[PDB]
Amino acid sequence: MEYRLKAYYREGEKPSALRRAGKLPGVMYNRHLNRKVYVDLVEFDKVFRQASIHHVIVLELPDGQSLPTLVRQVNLDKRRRRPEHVDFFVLSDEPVEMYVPLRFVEIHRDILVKVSPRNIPEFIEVDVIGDSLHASDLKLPPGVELAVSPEETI
């Protein structure tokens, strides 16, 4: 955390023309906006492989705005195994739900958390086959709330 990605607005360009032009059709939304965007495909690839829906990506739209977003959806073309659309969720102060990784001192790689965008952690640390514990017994740093039923096995 965190990363930056150029992002440009689109209106009537065909997604097929953009995809053929090496770009990634996408959308930007929250409670207050909704914009059709596109990122450059290769640029997005090297950010998302690291940022991966857990970590914040700041979009640098040409109009000067640096809007902080979380990737909320990536539809893939099932034949080619290539992304074909991205949902960038514009983060603002209101509390959001997101997936936070889990690093252990192994079912769930991450966990769903209700948090404010200020308090977005990088880690949630775990402890010490076949044994296992549940999300009930978990760390919960400042600002974060277990966004499931603790009946989840980890």
Binding site: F48, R49, S52, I53, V71, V74, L76, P83, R109, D110
Partner: peptide, 8 residues
């Protein structure tokens, strides 16, 4: 297994 996978 990529992040594209874990985002689904």
């Amino acid at each position: 297994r990529d992040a594209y996978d874990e985002a689904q």
